[model samples]
Target: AGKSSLFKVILLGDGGVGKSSLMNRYVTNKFDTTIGVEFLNKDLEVDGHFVTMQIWDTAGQERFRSLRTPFYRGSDCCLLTFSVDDSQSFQNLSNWKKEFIYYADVKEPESFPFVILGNKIDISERQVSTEEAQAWCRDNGDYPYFETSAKDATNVAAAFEEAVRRVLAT
Candidate 1:
């Protein structure tokens, strides 16, 4: 049997940005208000080793923000999501990152593995420009950014796969 490892991946974003949809799409080929924090397991083989992804989907609502903090511990990777059509959600990325760092008690918050997703790419009325997103990533630890469409399955699996790869490397 290959080496088995468990990695925690958290999905953080404002409400209605499709964090639930993205995780659901990746884990179950399915897509929620996300009333509370929930985690699901997705198993994969990487480099002849078995990896168990404990992906967490937290409620994006501000009221539950404190409740979600407990689930942030031991996160090996974080998928910070924002809808391309919502500038507010895009602007909140930094706050989410700070919260993750604080709650996860990460040693190197600046250099932590963060994969930002500009979700709902299938929609045409995107308010957040690609240039803007690229600049944000460039300025912020050069995090990898993916324009994913959970509805169309575009880059949905690839993003999660990349997260697993990053965790394995760590």
Candidate 2:
């Protein structure tokens, strides 16, 4: 499904949901327990098509909230991630969607490509269920959803691969 296209992707989520960890695992295949955001550009060949992916990891700090719009503007796709162990983070998914809506400038409520990630699924103290997360995604707009654990390199690669495929197909 890869089309030799460059997709500008921005990841959106609350603080401490392993966004950085997942980013590291996918782009660099290394985990870094660090705060704040990072940027990565990757080129990969899939199904005989080459893709240049530009990725931006947003800072999870509250102060960086204002930067979301400028960062998300013109993005080809977005990943809305939440910690299954943290309910507040799950609740913030709505805010992330709203921000995306405002920036993407498509008001039909179904134009953009939003992928849901219930991060940290491997945690023993998980509090959210896949059904709840799926329900949230459905009520919002029926976007793609997956449960992943970046700590143990669980589903990180597959999630991004499917995301890139979906983005290209769109």
Candidate 3:
């Protein structure tokens, strides 16, 4: 029998940025706004091992900040999502990362895996520039980035795919 591993992953971003959609998008191919937190599971085989991805989607609203931080610990990876069309949402990326690192409490903050997702790409209201995002990723541990639409089934699965792969790889 092969060994089975289940890892945790979290979603961090601003409210109404379609954070829930992104998770549910890949989840159900699939809520209401998430309150404090909710986790979804996606299973796969990596080589000869069984990998279970436990994706925890937390509330992006500031009100739930108190309830959210405790769940940040022990994550295999994090998706730093920001709506591509929401300029303000993009600006909050730095804050999200800092908060996460503090709560997730990783041994090596510099090397922890983070996947950036530019959500809401299905719309035409995008204001955040691609280069701006690249610069941020470059500065922040050279993290990998992807743009996806939670409204549709585009790139969402792939983004999560990369995340699980990273977790297993690490």
Candidate 4:
């Protein structure tokens, strides 16, 4: 494929949501913190085109806000991650999105592309229901949703593809 596209996908969510491990396993299964955060670059074929997915494993704490502020506008997509077992983390999804919009302001919230990842399904029980998550996405401009297990590498490859497609369409 001669044509190429570089897509930056930023992860937004509360702490312990596996954003770091998610990116690591995907890039390795191929592939976070406050100080400097972590982001990995992986070349993949999405929709039959050469695409470089820059996964920004962002920090969820207020202390590291400064680190990601300047890079928001450059992001092509946002992955609103939340641990399925943590109800508070699930509820904080809105806060993450709100913060992104406030900082990025690159596009209107309704027009912005996002993917909602309900991670840590490898756990026995879940605090957030799948139906609730899907409904939440549907209400919020119908963004795509995925239930993932970063520990076992489930649905992550597809998740990356979905994020790349969301940005590519825009």
Top model number, TM-score: 1
lDDT of 3 by residue, 1-170 (tens): 66788878899888888877887877777633356578888786667678888888877456767877888988989999998898899899988999998887878877788999888787886798778888888887788888888777678888887887877667
Spell out the clash pairs found in candidate 3.
none
Q: Is candidate 1 or candidate 3 better by TM-score?
A: 1
lDDT of each: 0.86, 0.79, 0.82, 0.85
- Candidate 4 structure quality by residue, lDDT tens digits, 70-157: 7777889999999999989988988889999989885567888989999999898989999999999898779999999888888988
Residue 76's lDDT in candidate 1: 88
Candidate 3's TM-score: 0.90
Give the better candidate number (1 or 2) by lDDT.
Answer: 1
Clashes, model 2: 0
Q: Please tell me which model should have the higher TM-score, number 3 or number 4.
A: 4
RMSD of 2: 2.8
The alpha-carbon lDDT assigned to residue 125 of candidate 2 equals 89
TM-score per candidate, chains pooled: 0.92, 0.87, 0.90, 0.91
Error of 4 at 151 (Å): 0.6
